[PDB]
A paper describes a structure:
One protein that we characterized from this newly-identified LarA subfamily is a putative enzyme from a commensal human gut bacterium B. wexlerae. However, co-expression with the NPN-synthesizing enzymes in L. lactis produced only colorless protein, indicating that the purified LarABw is in the apo state because otherwise the LarAH would be yellow or brown due to the NPN cofactor. Based on the SEC elution profile and comparison to marker proteins, the purified LarABw was in a large oligomeric state with an apparent molecular weight of ~360 kDa. Like other LarAHs, LarABw is a two-domain protein with the putative active site located between the N- and C-terminal domains. The large RMSD of 4.2 Å for the full-length proteins can also be attributed to the different domain orientations – LarABw adopts a conformation with the active site more open to the solvent than LarALp. The basic structure unit of the octamer is a symmetrical dimer in which the C-terminal domain of each protomer contacts through extensive polar interactions, burying 1076 Å2 surface area. Most of the polar interactions are mediated by the conserved Arg434, which uses its guanidinium side chain to form hydrogen bonds with multiple backbone carbonyl oxygen atoms from the other protomer. In contrast, the interactions between the neighboring dimers are mediated by nonconserved residues with only 300-400 Å2 of surface area buried at the interface, consistent with the notion that the octamer forms through the tetramerization of the dimers. A square-shaped cavity with a side length of ~40 Å is found within the octamer with an entrance size of ~16 Å at the centers of the top and bottom tetramers.
The organometallic nickel-pincer nucleotide (NPN) cofactor is composed of a nickel ion pincered by two sulfur and one carbon atoms from a pyridinium 3,5-dithiocarboxylate mononucleotide (P2TMN). Notably, although most LarAHs possess two catalytic histidine residues that are essential for the PCHT mechanism, the second histidine residue (His174 in LarALp) in a small fraction of LarAHs is substituted by other amino acids, often an asparagine which cannot function as a general acid/base in catalysis. In this study, we characterized two members of a newly identified LarA subfamily that lacks one of the catalytic histidine residues conserved in other LarAHs. From the structural data, combined with MS and spectroscopic analysis, as well as genomic context analysis, our findings revealed (1) a unique octameric assembly which is unprecedented among other known LarAHs; (2) a distinct set of active site residues, including the asparagine side chain substitution for the missing histidyl group, suggesting recognition and processing of non-canonical LarA substrates; and (3) genomic and structural evidence hypothetically linking these LarAHs to carbohydrate metabolism.
Numbering used by the authors:
A (entry chain E): 4 to 210, 234 to 407, 411 to 480
B (entry chain A): 4 to 211, 233 to 407, 412 to 480
C (entry chain H): 4 to 210, 234 to 407, 412 to 480
D (entry chain D): 4 to 210, 233 to 407, 412 to 480
């Protein structure tokens, strides 16, 4: 028997004995994580030896404003020794040694279009010491992209891309960027320039691009971003820490992140891909039950396992489509689904023309600003890759399969039924089945062939 | 760290080392079940030696109408060799050896107020062989309390109890009962005369341990022939321990002699103060019991009734559940209106709602949904107050819409540790005795008692 | 038998004979109120002898604009000899003697987030003479914190608190503050710097803090506030009148307000606290039936009687929970209750994050400005009852679903609730304390005799 | 200052010194009641001294079905020694001494159109001992006008009145009645044949001579007369005399003593203004003082009571919290009735009677009457005297005065303001005022001229 995440618990599937298992922490081991007693030495050596920049003790002085940009709770570790906490601690120590007071240093959570961080979210991000040190003084701020009184206009890049920036990060003397270099389904990395281009701008600037936008910010500001990026493994444990100028550091970190993300394990090309998504993963609770977020997750899974899989791919998923449109967090997705169903739109890519219609809605913008919900444009920042490539996608165990059927996904009730239907219709009676347990509870990797 | 059921998965809790763990079967062993090989001999011996009744061959003759009453899907087994399947199979073999026509055998699924069984439910209850052999012939009928053309008003007992019983059972020449002798929170075992008194009666005969026996004996007196019971005692994993068949009235004490040994566990050394468990979404009555506020209160009241003899008077109950507000309105269409009436009336407690029971059992739309949609009868909710007077505080941990748990009188918190700290603050003190019950709603529950 | 306020009338409770009664003023007598024959002398001596400031005759002249800040109807006396009326009368006499004309003097009712005063509210606050003298010329104004063209920006204090101020009180040559020195459940007092901080600001300035904000206003204006505050007793009768600079006079008034507010009477720690809330108390009609205002009142009662009460204290309350949201006065509290019930809100504090969501609502702001309703941020300006008491019983409720949705226990009669509490929490020998008319009087903080 | 009931508490009024105060029991003393010690002797003497039938021993024998008809909770005391409890207890003692089985005794709560009594109501009516002895056996049944399987169509009287009777009372061998003889606004009395005609009849039999004719038709159809045990009550519902026997011949004797109580001679001047207040809970129950139609009923009752003491320029000033609290759980039909009054050609209340048969046949309201313990929909049509006689009716202190204005009643904010307006317009500057400060809390009496 095989155990796949099903909403909150686990669905059991009786797959043929030719099934293979890939858990990206056990099948192929990641590069060794830095031991917890060598983390201080690694951080000190990285901060004291930046790439294409002087040390923090050289760029800091008394009265020089410092803004530290910290990512939100979507990605990265939340443990007692995560990259964010240690990096902030040692950066603060360096700045205090340089002669910068605590009253000046400001912290900004860079969500961009993700919901603004609450008190509990900041507690989980910064820990227990930084939380008590800075939150009550008003020195920890969540980035608001609709606050026209805190957004500055930098003009347009050489390619005509508009650039809007946070005012707080624009008026400081020392801008510090903290990011986690981790893989993305599209092939890019969530390093320094991508983090600055995504988490500091607004929806207009989001609608090679990231490098241009971040370089435009650096030119307008007058001082380049000091980025301290850590290469994370599947358990969000730092492997290497690279600090300094983002442009000359990003390739250095990528040369090692390619070792972790791209796993050469495949010996054959598979026909059936079996997994399941729990209710709460990635963007938060309700992702595994909201149809549009399910489509995005399935598209990411298709992108990640494209090389390992054959032409007529078949994807079997175990998710609880109870129709749970998490509405305190995605207040616009019900209208999005209704517009998709009750219009002339044959496929998801036909929805893009409504993006500016949703990003400018007053009620959803108010909910984004004050209720801690997603920005209405986040649904258009994808879903179409799932529709192509795969012959059929099965959503087994759904509670309201009408929502999974309205997205174009086939619906069944048990893994064996869906597998038998796929064998009868698409993949024949001898399918190469690949089972992915805990594919959404870990940092997913791009599977490739040993060729 | 301890693990508890939470909706579908598992919520983890950090509890002090003094916490004690109880599993119904793993901690204290149930009496040994008969092995799968000896089910043959045990069933044949039980059928060949009925208690207080002649053997079924004597009861059967050519051209005799036989009605076999099979319980619902709530709690009966459903393994490969469950009691229902084996008992039905051997009864059918013996009846065929008695020369009884196959067209005179009729199966009645006795639900009473539980939803009528569909094709999949009937298949799961009866096994694929019996489902293929009998379903398409039309010989498997779910009991319908509101089918007035197929219900017979017997009259009244001596205690003013109206009696209405299925006409199919009334007109048969051999009534056979299939029953599982399993414990109840109140103490009256669920197999025997209770099965006949509850499963083939309408809500008026339920609205009114001696009551069930009186009603069933009145049924036997009116019919002229007693029910032929085939009751099996089950353990936590729904495995047979002993099989008793014959006259229900005289066989019931014999079955109880072993059901008491199974049900009443004697593992205890201290009077515990805090009871910790969790509600899965699907248990007992089906999917949605762990999120429906009324059904959550019912389950909590059952848990209070089971463990009251091991718990103190300032006890605190901490349960993990996902109070989504998911009433499962396709299966309990009356519970949303019931909840609204609870909130929007002069009702301080749940027992104040019983005066509306006759109001709900007579609703035309809910009765239609019960008959044709496979939903619960509207009077099931009124057939739940022990928790709100026995316990000092009841905590619902990890609720997704904590308004429903608060509206029923239960406190709400976010994590097990937070609720335990609050309870230690106010109710049980900083040095409590904790009893943790993982997999309490996944296994057949038992009554806990002091060792002495 | 015992009589407790129940909505509009009274519920009767057969409490055991060991029950104790505390009524403010009646049980322990307050300091003697100034006789009506000495009020003129007291006011004249206070105004002629200010603290840290000179007399109104020494600061006033011909053409110098004067703005008099007067509190709203929530607190203070509405009698024929209340502090507001007499203070305004004698201040006007002094100013007229100095040389200031009536055409210039302006009156501002400082509510802040409380509803703007209507014609009848000004009636009750000011009296016949001042009403007829000043309202019909448009010289009595109710403070509007949402009026962007009548609010000025003073920047941000040294600690990081933004300061918004009323324009009328900013452009005047002589700002005069009238406040009442009365106790608060949290420990602080009303009137003085607190009145100016919470009265003529907006919700952003409200979200030692009051001292910093008020000193920032005084620095920006250049004229310190001339505060004339009277220490009130349980019947809103003046005990002492202190005039002058607020910073150097607040301790002087506090040294005597501590004598009245802090009553050392207890001889034992009580287990059960029994009282009842009428429908109309404090913030107006519907407070005793609105679940959120009920929770606020219960929290205030918990704060006031914390020292007299045991660790396992049980509160029994008699209120008519008819679900009567005074939707013409609290248009937002139904949405607030629905958000509390239908979201991931385990407790009331978890709702604070929605404060900025409500304070910026356009419809509720319009209703606050023009309909005379509460500002939507007043609700977020609660948990103490949940943290402290083992159980809270709301007896006599009409729709107990609302009292249950707040986390409170619901019963039907005092005896049933008392028996339940005895069986569950407080045992069979509880120290019961009964508070008749605890919401119809100026409540006091009960302390221990020793 | 004067005090009046106002919702739940008391509104205070400033009235001139010429105002006269009347309290039914205190101003003029009722005839002396029998003491609590002599209740036993008086009850035994009354039971042993019938007024036209043989004693209860003669009617009783082995195997006799006895049906005892107990009035509703609307009227009559609920003290420790109320008439219902004592009469039932002594009747049961006599029947047991006569050899009547306990299983052949059945109690019927005669409500007729009032809501069916619940468990708590039955407990309060019957006393704890009798409730424990008889309720759980199933021997206490509330009358159900719409229970067609338990209703018998007796036939028709000579006036065309149709007669429908409770089947339980019809088949019994001894029908016994418990009744309280206290006055009505119309001049009748609530005990005697009226109890039979109203309590155990449906709405068709309801839509002084009529009650007697219907009850005597019932007696002639059953073959045996009702055995009545009627008690005269004072303001505090205390017994003055107990009359038992044939109702037709006993009724004048009971009336001879009820006249001395109901009619009070305390008038020396023709009063002009009548001042009182409606409490929230009185007569029919909670919500009578706030429901506009029940407020009109109460005002009409007051007008009928005090019409012989007041002039022809009547002004009625009443304090009530008319907040629109219809108590829809007890009067579910009154909101629709109010809407039909407002939104049709109804100029006055008596114009609505043509819809009475429309409401009494409603299925939803009948279901709520049978199963939810609400009023029968025809109760509201069983109200025009107030608007006919009084020149102006003032509702003082209403919280939603739209309902008081919609029924034709003037609305003001305070007692003094309404009195000033009435003096200005109707009664002049020198009126005669009669103040009733406990009119709705005590059993009302009919005021009359002293001469």
């Amino acid at each position: 028997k095989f155990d796949f995440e099903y909403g909150q618990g686990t669905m059991s599937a009786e797959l043929p004995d030719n099934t293979d298992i890939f858990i990206p922490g056990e099948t192929v081991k990641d590069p060794d994580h830095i031991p917890e007693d060598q983390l201080e030495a690694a951080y000190l050596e990285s901060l004291a030896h930046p790439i294409g920049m002087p040390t923090l003790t050289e760029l800091a002085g008394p009265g020089k404003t410092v803004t530290i940009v910290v990512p939100d709770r979507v990605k990265g570790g939340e443990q007692a020794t995560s990259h964010r906490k240690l990096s902030i601690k040692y950066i603060l120590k360096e700045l205090y040694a340089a002669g910068v007071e605590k009253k000046d240093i400001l912290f900004i959570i860079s969500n961009g279009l993700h919901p603004r961080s609450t008190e509990a979210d900041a507690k989980a991000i910064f820990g227990e010491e930084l939380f008590n040190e800075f939150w009550h003084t008003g020195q920890i701020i969540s980035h608001d992209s609709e606050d026209q009184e805190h957004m500055v206009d930098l003009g347009t890049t050489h390619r005509g891309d508009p650039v809007y920036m946070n005012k707080y990060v624009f008026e400081c003397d020392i801008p510090i960027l903290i990011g986690h270099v981790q893989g993305n389904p599209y092939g890019g990395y969530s390093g320094g320039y991508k983090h600055s281009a995504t988490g500091i701008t607004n929806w207009k600037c989001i609608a090679n691009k990231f490098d241009e936008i971040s370089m435009h910010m650096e030119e307008k500001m007058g001082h380049p971003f000091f980025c301290c990026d850590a290469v994370l493994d599947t358990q969000s444990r730092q492997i290497a820490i690279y600090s300094g100028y983002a442009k000359e550091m990003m390739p250095i970190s990528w040369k090692l992140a390619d070792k972790r993300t791209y796993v050469h394990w495949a010996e054959k090309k598979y026909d059936v891909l079996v997994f399941g998504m729990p209710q709460k993963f990635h963007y938060g609770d309700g992702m595994g039950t909201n149809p549009i977020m399910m489509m995005q997750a399935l598209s990411a899974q298709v992108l990640r396992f494209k090389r390992v899989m054959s032409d007529n791919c078949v994807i079997i998923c175990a998710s609880t489509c109870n129709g749970y449109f998490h509405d305190e967090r995605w207040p616009y997705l019900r209208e999005l689904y209704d517009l998709f169903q009750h219009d002339h739109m044959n496929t998801l890519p036909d929805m893009n023309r409504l993006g500016e219609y949703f990003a400018t809605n007053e009620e959803y913008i108010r909910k984004y600003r004050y209720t801690n919900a997603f920005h209405p444009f986040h649904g258009f920042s994808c879903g179409h890759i799932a529709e192509m490539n795969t012959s059929a996608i099965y959503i087994v165990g759904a509670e309201e399969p009408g929502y999974a059927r309205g997205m174009g996904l086939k619906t069944r009730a048990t893994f064996e039924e869906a597998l038998e239907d796929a064998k009868k219709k698409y993949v024949g009676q001898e399918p190469n089945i690949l089972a992915l347990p805990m594919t959404f509870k870990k940092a997913a990797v791009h599977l490739c062939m040993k060729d």
